[PDB]
Design a protein around this nucleic acid. Structure first.
Length: 40
RNA sequence: GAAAGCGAGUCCGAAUAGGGCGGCAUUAGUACGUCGGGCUAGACUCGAAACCAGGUGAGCUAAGCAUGACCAGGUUGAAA
């Protein structure tokens, strides 16, 4: 698959399309611009 | 972490002690080569008594079977 995890930190707007992501993973993206996108 | 799975966190547990991990002041690898050593192969070299497989042997020897051969001379003296 493809998971998204929260390690890096600088803040900015970017929309990711990972096949999976963690809690604060998402709750870190949009929280600075961008959209986490999981398969339907 | 047994795993689902969760994620810089995660397994114990019903939350608070710990184990493993990140951060730790720091810190990358990977491909090819020479080499040290490991592993699996006969595995530094040489040596076994033995075990297993297929065949060669009764022209020696142990016996069988068919067909032939041989036993001076003397002694004794059974039945009838």
């Amino acid at each position: 698959p493809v998971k998204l995890l929260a390690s890096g930190e600088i803040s900015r707007a970017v929309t990711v399309h990972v096949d999976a992501a963690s809690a604060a993973a998402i709750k870190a993206v949009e929280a600075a611009g961008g959209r986490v996108v999981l398969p339907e």
